[PDB]
Coordinates of C-alpha atoms and ligand atoms in Angstrom, one line a residue:
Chain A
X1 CA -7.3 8.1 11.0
X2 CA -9.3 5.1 9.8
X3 CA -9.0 1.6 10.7
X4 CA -6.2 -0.5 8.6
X5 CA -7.4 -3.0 6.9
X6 CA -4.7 -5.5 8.0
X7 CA -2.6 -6.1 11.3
X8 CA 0.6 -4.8 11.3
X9 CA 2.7 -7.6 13.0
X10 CA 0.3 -10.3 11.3
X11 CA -1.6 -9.9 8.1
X12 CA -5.0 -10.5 9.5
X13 CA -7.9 -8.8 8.4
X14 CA -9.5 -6.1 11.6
X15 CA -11.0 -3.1 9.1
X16 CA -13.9 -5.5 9.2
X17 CA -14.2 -6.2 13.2
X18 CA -14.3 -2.3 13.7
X19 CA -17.7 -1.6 14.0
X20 CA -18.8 -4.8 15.7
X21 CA -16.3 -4.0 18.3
X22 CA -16.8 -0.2 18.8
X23 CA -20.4 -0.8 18.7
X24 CA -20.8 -3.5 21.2
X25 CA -17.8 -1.6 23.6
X26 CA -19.7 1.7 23.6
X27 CA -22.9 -0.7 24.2
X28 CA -21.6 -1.3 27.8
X29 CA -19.7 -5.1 27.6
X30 CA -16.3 -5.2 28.5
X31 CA -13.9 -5.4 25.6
X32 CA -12.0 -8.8 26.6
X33 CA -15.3 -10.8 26.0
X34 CA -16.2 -8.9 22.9
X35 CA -12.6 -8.9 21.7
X36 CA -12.5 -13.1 22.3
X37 CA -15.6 -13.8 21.1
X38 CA -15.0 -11.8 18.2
X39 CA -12.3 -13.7 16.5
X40 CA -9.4 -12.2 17.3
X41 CA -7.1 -13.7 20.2
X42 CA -3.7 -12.6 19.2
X43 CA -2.4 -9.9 20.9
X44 CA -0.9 -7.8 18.2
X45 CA -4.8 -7.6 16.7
X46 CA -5.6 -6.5 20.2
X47 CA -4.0 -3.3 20.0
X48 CA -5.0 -3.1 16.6
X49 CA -8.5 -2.4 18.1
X50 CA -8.1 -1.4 21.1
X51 CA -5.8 1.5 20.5
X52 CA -7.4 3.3 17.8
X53 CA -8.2 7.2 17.4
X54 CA -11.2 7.0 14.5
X55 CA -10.0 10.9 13.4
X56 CA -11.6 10.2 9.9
X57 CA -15.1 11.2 11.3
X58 CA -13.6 14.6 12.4
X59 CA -11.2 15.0 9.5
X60 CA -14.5 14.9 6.9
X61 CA -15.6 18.3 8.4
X62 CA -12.3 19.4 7.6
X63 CA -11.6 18.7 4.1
X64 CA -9.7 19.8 1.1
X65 CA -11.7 21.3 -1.5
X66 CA -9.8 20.0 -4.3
Chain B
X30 CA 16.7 -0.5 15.7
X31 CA 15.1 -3.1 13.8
X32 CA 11.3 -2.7 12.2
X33 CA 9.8 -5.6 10.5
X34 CA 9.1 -4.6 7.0
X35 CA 6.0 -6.4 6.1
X36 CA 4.1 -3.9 9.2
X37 CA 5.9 -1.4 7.1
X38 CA 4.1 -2.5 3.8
X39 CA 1.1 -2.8 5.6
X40 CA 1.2 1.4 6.7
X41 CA 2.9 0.9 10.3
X42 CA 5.0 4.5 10.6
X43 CA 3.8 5.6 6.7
X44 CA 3.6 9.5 6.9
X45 CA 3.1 12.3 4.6
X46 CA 5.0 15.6 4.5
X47 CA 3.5 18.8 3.3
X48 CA 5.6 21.8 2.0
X49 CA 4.2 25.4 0.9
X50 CA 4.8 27.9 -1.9
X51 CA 3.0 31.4 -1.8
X52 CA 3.6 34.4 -3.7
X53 CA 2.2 37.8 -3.6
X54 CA 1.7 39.8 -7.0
X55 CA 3.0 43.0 -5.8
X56 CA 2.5 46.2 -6.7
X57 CA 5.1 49.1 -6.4
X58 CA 5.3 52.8 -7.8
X59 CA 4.5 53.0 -11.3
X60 CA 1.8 53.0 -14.6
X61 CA -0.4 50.1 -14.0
X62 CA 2.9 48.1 -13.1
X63 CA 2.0 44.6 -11.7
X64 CA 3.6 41.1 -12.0
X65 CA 1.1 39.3 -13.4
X66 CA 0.7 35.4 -12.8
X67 CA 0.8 33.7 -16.5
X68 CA 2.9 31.1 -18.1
X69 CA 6.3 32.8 -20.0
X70 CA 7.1 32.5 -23.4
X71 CA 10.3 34.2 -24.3
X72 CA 11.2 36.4 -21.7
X73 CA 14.9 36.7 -19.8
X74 CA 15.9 34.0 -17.0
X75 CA 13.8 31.2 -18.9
X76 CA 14.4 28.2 -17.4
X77 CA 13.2 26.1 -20.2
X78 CA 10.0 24.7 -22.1
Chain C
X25 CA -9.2 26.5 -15.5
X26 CA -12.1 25.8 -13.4
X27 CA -12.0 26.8 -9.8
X28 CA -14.6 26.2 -6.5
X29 CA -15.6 28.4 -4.4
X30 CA -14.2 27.8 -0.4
X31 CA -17.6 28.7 1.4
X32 CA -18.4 25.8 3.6
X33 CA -17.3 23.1 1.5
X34 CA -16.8 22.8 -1.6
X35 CA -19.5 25.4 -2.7
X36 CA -20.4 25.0 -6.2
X37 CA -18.0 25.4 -9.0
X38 CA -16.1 28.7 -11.1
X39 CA -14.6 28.5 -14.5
X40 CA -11.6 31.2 -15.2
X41 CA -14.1 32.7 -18.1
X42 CA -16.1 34.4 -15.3
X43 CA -14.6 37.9 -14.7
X44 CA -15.0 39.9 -12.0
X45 CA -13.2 42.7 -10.0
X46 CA -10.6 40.9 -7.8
X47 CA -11.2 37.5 -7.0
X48 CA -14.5 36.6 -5.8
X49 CA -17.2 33.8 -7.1
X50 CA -20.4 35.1 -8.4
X51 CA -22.6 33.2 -6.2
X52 CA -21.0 34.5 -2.6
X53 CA -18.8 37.5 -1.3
X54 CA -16.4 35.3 -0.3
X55 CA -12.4 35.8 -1.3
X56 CA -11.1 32.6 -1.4
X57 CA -11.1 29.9 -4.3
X58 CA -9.4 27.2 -4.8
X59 CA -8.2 25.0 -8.6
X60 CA -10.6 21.4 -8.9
X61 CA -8.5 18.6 -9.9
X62 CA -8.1 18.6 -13.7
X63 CA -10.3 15.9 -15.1
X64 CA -7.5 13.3 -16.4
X65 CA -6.9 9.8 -14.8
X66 CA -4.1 9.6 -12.7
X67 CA -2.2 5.9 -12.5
X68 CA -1.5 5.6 -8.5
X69 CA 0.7 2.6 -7.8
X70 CA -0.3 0.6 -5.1
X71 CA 3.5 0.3 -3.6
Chain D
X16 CA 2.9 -38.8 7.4
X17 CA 0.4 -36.2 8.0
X18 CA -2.0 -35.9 10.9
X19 CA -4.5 -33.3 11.2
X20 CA -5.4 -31.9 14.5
X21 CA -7.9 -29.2 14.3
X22 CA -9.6 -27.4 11.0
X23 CA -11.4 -24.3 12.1
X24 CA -12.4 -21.6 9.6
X25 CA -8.9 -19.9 7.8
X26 CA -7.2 -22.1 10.2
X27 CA -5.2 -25.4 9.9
X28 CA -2.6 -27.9 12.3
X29 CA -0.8 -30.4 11.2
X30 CA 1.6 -32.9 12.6
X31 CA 4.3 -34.2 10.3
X32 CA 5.9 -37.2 11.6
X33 CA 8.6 -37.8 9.4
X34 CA 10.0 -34.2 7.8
X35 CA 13.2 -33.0 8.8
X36 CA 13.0 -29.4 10.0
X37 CA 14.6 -27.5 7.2
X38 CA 12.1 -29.0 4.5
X39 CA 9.0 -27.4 7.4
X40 CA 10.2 -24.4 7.9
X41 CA 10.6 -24.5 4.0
X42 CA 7.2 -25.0 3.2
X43 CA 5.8 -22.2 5.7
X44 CA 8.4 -19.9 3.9
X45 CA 7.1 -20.9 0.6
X46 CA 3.5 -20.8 2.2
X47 CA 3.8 -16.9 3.1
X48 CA 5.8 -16.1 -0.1
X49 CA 5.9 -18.4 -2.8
X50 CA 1.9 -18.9 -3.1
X51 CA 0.4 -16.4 -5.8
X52 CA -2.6 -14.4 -4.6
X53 CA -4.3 -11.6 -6.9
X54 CA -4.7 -8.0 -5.2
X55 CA -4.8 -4.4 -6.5
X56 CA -1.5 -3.5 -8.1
X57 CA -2.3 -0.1 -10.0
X58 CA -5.2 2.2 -9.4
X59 CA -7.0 4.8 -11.9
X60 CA -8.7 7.6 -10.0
X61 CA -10.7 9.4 -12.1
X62 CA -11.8 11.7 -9.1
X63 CA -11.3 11.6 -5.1
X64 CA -12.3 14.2 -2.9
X65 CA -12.4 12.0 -0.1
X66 CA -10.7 12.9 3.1
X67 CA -7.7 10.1 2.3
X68 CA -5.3 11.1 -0.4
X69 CA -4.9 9.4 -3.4
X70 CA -1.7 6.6 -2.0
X71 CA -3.8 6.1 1.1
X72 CA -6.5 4.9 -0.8
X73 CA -4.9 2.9 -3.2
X74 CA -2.7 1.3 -0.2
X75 CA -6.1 0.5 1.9
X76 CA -7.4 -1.0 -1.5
X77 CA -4.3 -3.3 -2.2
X78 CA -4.5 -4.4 1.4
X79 CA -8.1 -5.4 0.5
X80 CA -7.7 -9.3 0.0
X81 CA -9.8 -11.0 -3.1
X82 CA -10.8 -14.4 -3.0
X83 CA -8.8 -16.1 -5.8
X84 CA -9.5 -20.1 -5.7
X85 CA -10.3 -19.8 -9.2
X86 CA -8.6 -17.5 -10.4
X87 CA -4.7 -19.2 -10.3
X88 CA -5.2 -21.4 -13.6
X89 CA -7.2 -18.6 -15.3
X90 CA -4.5 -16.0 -14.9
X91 CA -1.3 -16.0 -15.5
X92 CA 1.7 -15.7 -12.8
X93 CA 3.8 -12.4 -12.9
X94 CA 6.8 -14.1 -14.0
X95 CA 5.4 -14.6 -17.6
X96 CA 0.0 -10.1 -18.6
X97 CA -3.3 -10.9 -18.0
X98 CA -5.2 -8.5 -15.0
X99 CA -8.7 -8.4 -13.5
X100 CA -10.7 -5.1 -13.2
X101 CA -12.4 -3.7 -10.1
X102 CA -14.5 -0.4 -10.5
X103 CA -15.3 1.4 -7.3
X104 CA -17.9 4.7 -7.9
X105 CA -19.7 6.2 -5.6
X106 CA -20.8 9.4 -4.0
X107 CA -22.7 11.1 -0.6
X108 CA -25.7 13.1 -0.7
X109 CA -25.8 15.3 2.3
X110 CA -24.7 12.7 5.1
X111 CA -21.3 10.9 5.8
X112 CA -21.4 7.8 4.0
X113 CA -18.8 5.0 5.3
X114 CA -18.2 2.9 1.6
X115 CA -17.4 -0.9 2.3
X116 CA -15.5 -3.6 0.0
X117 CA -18.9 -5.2 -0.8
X118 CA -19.5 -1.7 -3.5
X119 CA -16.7 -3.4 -4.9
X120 CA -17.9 -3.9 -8.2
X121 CA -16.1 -6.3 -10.3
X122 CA -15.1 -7.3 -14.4
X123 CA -14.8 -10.9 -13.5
X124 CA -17.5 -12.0 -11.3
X125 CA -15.8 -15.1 -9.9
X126 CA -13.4 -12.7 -8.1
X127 CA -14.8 -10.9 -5.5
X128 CA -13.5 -9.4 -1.6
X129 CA -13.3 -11.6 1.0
X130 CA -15.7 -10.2 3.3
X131 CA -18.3 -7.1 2.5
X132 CA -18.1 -5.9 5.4
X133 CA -14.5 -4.2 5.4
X134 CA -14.4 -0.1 5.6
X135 CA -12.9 1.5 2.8
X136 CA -13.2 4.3 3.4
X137 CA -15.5 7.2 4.8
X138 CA -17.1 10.1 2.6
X139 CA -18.5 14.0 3.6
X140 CA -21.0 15.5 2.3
X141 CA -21.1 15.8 -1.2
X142 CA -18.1 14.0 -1.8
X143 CA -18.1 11.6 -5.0
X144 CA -14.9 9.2 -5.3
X145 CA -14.3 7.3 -8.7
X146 CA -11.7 4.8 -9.5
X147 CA -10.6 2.0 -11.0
X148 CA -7.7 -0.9 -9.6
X149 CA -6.2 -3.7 -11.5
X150 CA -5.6 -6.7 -9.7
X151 CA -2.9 -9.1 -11.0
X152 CA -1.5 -12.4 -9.3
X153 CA 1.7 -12.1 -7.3
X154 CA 4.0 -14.0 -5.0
X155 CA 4.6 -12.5 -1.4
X156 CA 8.8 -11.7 -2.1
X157 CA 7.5 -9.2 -4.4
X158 CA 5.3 -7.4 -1.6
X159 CA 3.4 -8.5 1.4
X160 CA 0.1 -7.9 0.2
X161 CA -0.1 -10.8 -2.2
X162 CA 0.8 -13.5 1.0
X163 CA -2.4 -16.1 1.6
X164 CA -1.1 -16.5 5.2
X165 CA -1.8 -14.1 8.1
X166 CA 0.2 -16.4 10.3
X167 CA 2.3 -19.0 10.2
X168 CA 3.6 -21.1 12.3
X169 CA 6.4 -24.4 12.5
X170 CA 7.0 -25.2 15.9
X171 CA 8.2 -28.7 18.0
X172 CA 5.9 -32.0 19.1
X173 CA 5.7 -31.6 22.8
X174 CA 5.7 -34.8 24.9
X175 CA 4.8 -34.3 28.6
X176 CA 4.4 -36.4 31.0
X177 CA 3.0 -36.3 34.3
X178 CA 5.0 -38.2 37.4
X179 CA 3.1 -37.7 40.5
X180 CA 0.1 -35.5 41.5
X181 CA 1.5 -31.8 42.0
X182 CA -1.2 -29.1 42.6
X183 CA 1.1 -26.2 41.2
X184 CA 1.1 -27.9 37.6
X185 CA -1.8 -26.9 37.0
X186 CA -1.4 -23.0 37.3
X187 CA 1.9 -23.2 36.6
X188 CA 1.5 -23.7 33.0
X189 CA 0.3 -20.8 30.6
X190 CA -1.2 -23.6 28.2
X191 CA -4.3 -26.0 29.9
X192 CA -1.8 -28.5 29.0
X193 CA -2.6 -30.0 33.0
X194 CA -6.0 -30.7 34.8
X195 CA -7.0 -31.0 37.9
X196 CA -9.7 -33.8 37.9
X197 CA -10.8 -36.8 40.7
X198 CA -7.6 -35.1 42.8
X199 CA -5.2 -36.4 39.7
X200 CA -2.5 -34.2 37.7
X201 CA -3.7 -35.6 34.1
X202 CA -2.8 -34.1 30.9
X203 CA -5.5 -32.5 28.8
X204 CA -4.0 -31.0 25.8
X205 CA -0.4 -32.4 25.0
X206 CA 0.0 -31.0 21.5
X207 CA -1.1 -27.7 23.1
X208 CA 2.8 -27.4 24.8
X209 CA 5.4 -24.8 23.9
X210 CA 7.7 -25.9 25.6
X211 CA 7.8 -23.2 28.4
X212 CA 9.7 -25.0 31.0
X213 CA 7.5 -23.1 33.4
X214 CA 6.1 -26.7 34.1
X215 CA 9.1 -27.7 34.8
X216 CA 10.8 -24.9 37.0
X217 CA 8.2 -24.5 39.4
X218 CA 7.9 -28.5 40.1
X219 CA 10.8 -30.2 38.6
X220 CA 10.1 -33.9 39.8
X221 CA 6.3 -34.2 39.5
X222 CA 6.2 -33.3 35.2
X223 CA 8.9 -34.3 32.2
X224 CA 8.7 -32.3 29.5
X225 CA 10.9 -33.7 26.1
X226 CA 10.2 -32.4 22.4
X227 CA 9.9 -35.2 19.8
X228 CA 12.8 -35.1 16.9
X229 CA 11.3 -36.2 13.9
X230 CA 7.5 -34.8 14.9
X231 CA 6.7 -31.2 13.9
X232 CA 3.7 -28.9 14.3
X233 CA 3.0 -26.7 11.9
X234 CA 0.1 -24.1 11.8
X235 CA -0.9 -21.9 8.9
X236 CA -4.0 -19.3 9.0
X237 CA -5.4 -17.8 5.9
X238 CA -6.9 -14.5 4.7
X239 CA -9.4 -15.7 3.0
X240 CA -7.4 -16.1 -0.5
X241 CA -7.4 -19.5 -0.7
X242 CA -8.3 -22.8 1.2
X243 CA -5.1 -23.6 3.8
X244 CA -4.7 -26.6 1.9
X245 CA -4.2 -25.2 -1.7
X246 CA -2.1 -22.8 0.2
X247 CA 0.5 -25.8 0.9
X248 CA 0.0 -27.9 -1.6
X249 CA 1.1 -24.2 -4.4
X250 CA 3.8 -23.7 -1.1
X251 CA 5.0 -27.7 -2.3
X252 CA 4.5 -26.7 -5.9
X253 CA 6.6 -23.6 -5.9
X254 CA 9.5 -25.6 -4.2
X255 CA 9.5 -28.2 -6.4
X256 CA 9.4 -25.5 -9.3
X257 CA 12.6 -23.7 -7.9
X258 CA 14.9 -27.3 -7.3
X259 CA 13.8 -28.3 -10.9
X260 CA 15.0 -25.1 -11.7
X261 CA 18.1 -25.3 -10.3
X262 CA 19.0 -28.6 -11.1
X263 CA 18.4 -28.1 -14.4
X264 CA 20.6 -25.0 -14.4
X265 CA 23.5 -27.3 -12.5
X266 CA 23.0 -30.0 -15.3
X267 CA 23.5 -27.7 -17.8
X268 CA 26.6 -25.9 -15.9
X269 CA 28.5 -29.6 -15.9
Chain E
X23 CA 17.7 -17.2 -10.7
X24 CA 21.3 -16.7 -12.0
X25 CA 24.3 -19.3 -10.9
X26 CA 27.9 -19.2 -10.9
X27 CA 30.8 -21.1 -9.3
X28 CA 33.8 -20.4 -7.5
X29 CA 36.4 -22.4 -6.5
X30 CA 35.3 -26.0 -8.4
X31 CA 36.8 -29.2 -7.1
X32 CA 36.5 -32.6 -6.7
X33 CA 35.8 -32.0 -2.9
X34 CA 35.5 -28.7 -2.5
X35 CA 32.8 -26.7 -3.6
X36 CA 31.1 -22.7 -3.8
X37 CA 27.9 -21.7 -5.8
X38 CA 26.3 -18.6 -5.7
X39 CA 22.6 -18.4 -6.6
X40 CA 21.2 -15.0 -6.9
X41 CA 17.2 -14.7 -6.1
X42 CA 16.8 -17.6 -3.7
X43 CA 16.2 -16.3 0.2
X44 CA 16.9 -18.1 3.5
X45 CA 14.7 -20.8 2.7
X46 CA 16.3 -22.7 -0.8
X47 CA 19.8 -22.4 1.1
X48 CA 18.5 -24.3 4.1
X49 CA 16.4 -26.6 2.5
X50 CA 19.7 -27.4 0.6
X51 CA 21.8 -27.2 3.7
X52 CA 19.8 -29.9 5.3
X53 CA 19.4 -32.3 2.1
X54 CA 23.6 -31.9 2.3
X55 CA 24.3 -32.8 5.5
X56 CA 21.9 -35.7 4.9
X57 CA 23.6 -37.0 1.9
X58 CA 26.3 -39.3 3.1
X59 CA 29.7 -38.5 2.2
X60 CA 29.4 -35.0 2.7
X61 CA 31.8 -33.3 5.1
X62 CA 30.5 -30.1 5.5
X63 CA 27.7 -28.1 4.1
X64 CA 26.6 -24.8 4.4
X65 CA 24.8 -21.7 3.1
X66 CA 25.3 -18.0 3.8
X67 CA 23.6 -15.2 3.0
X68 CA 26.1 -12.4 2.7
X69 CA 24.0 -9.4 2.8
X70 CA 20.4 -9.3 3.4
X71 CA 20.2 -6.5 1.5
X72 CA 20.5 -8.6 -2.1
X73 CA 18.5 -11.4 -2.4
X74 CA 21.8 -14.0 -3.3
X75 CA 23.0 -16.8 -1.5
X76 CA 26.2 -18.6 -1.3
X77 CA 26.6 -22.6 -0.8
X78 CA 29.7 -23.8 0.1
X79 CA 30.3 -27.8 0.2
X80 CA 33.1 -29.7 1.3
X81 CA 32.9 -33.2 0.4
X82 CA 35.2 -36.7 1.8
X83 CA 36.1 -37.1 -1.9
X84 CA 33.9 -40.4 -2.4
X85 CA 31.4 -38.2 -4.7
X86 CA 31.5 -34.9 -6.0
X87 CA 30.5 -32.2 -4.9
X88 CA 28.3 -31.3 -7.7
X89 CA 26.9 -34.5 -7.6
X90 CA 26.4 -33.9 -3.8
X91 CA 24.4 -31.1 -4.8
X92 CA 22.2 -32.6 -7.2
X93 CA 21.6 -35.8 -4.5
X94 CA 20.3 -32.9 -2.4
X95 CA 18.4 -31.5 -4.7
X96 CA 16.4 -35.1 -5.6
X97 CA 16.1 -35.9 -1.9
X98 CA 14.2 -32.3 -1.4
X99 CA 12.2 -32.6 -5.0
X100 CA 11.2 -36.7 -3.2
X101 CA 10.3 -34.6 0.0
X102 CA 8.0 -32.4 -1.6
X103 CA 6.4 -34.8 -3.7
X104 CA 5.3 -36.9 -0.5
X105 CA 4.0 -34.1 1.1
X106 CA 2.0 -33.3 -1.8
X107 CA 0.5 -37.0 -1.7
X108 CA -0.2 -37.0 2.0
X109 CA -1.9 -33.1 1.8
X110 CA -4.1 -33.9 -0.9
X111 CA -5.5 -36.9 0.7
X112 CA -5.9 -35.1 4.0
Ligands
F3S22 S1 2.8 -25.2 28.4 FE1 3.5 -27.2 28.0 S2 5.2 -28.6 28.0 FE2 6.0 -27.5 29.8 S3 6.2 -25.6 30.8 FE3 4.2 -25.1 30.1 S4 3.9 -27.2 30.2
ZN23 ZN1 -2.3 -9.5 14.3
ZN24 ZN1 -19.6 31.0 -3.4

């Protein structure tokens, strides 16, 4: 839904390298440089980035009154 | 299976489960007979204040 | 009791004193209204 | 002794020469748990119409790490009542609005989020959200959001040797351990070694790979909480505090 | 943390401490078996569900086990303090 704030295996911080990442992948660079240069070189961060849905931006259409 | 419990604390498989309640205040055959939504006082099958 | 009025979202606001044949706001002919959360603070523990 | 190896940002390596493994893996143990770190540990919500519920948020906000150098003599531990304030209150106008942990606003300006730049989260139109967290200082046994460690890690002192010139070697080996330079097997990084074996079970007689007994590695990488050092040195600290502790309760028991 | 002994001897020895994890009962397990004297040392953990451990030492009968426990306990307090020294400095 929206990004977590920490890796699940490790406790790292990746909320933060969202929108770096997604901006400079849809840019047109392939995501291992990006990924490496950004500061994350684990694996299990990797996947935290990689594989992920954003469904927040179309969940805010469809909200709860409340 | 065994899942490391600090992903857990950290929202790995977190989920949410939504149940629903709806009513209908139905009228039937009568004068002006309705069952009208408001909190009881003193009436039969009171469960309790 | 105030209550909002479903068009789009969250359209404007209803309070309970408003009367009116059925249920409908004033503002739209929509049907459908839904409660606001009740203005209290609510203690969330963080796990 | 202590040798460091390499201090990047969040990041530290040491080599301890003469620990014996239980006190190492010890003092990483104590490093993710016994090392007090404030975060959020009750939120008020005065409103929220955001798109995540009310638990969501308040889980995403106590994931949120604080920088808390400062603040482990100026507040007291959980095991004796004294907890920071962090008001978050804001609201869209007619686009979405993505709120970060920089509009973090805070009661004691010392303590502050690590970075700015981490999503909270992200707001529709018209949508106000109002709340208010209370951080307090806690070890990681209690939960895993108060550990100042993302990773750490205690592992052996390699020693690798190279006997012969053996192309393979150099491919072999998942670490750059090996290089290939003036047509001569040479060893670049020795400390870099896990202790694969790949080295050695591709070209058994050309490398000799031994770990070294009283030589440990050991690795820690912070959040952001607190410098890698304070980390060990309140790791050290809370170790000490639990053997006085118990010895005191074994004096008193003869 | 809560103690409490079982089956106090001269030799023998069990102590259970409740709300130390893996990492008290090994530290102690290796200051044990360093000690001399000490036949044999260990700690369990008999459910990982409750945070208590149990020691159980088993000593030659030169020293007591108690005491054998309290040597550990000063060899892993002088540990600590030396790598608090050599970490500051560094
Ligand atoms: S990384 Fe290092 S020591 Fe042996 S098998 Fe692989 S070389
Ligand atoms: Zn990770
Ligand atoms: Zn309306």
């Amino acid at each position: 839904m929206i990004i977590p704030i920490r890796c699940f295996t490790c406790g790292a911080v990746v909320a933060d390298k969202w929108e770096p990442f997604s901006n400079r992948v849809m840019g047109g660079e392939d995501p291992e440089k990006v990924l490496t240069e950004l500061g994350v070189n684990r694996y299990c961060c990797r996947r935290m980035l990689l594989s992920h849905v954003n469904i927040i931006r179309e969940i805010i259409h469809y909200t709860r009154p409340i | 299976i065994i899942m490391n419990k600090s992903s857990i604390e950290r929202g790995m498989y977190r989920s949410t489960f939504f149940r629903l309640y709806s009513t209908e205040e139905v009228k039937y055959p009568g004068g002006q007979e309705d069952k009208i939504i408001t909190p009881e006082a003193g009436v039969k099958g009171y469960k309790g204040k | 009791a105030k209550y909002r009025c479903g068009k789009c979202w969250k359209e404007l606001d209803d309070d309970q004193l408003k009367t009116l044949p059925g249920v409908r706001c004033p503002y739209c002919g929509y049907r459908i209204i839904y409660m606001v959360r009740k203005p209290t603070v609510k203690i969330v523990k963080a796990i | 002794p202590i040798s460091l190896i390499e201090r990047n940002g969040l990041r530290l390596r040491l080599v301890l020469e003469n620990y014996p493994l239980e006190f190492v893996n010890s003092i990483r143990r104590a490093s993710i748990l016994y090392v007090p770190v404030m975060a959020v540990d009750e939120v008020y919500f005065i409103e929220n119409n955001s798109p995540l519920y009310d638990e969501i948020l308040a889980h995403r906000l106590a994931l949120v790490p604080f920088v808390s150098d400062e603040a482990l003599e100026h507040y007291r531990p959980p095991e004796e009542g004294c907890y920071n304030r962090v008001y978050l209150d804001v609201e869209a106008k007619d686009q979405p609005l993505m709120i970060y942990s920089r509009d973090l606003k805070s009661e004691d300006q010392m303590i502050t989020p690590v970075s700015g730049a981490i999503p909270i989260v992200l707001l529709g139109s018209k949508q106000k959200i109002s709340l208010e967290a209370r951080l307090r200082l806690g070890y990681g046994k209690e939960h895993i959001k108060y550990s100042p460690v993302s990773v750490s890690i205690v592992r052996y002192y390699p020693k690798v040797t190279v006997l012969g010139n053996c192309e393979k070697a150099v491919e072999v080996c998942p670490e750059g351990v090996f290089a290939m330079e003036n047509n001569k097997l040479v060893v670049k990084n020795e400390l870099s070694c896990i202790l694969c074996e790949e080295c050695l079970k591709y070209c058994a007689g050309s490398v000799s790979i031994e770990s070294v007994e009283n030589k440990f590695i050991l690795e820690i990488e912070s959040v952001g909480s607190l410098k890698p050092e304070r980390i060990l040195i309140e790791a050290s600290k809370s170790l000490l505090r639990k053997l006085s502790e118990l010895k005191s309760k074994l004096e008193a028991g003869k | 943390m809560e103690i409490k002994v079982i089956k106090e001897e001269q030799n023998y020895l069990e102590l259970q401490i409740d709300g130390e994890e893996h990492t008290i009962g090994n530290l102690l397990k290796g200051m044990l078996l360093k000690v001399p004297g000490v036949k044999f040392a260990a700690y369990s953990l008999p459910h990982p569900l409750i945070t208590s451990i149990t020691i159980k030492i088993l000593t030659d009968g030169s020293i007591s086990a108690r005491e054998a426990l309290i040597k550990a306990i000063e060899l892993a307090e002088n540990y600590a303090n030396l790598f608090i020294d050599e970490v500051k400095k560094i």
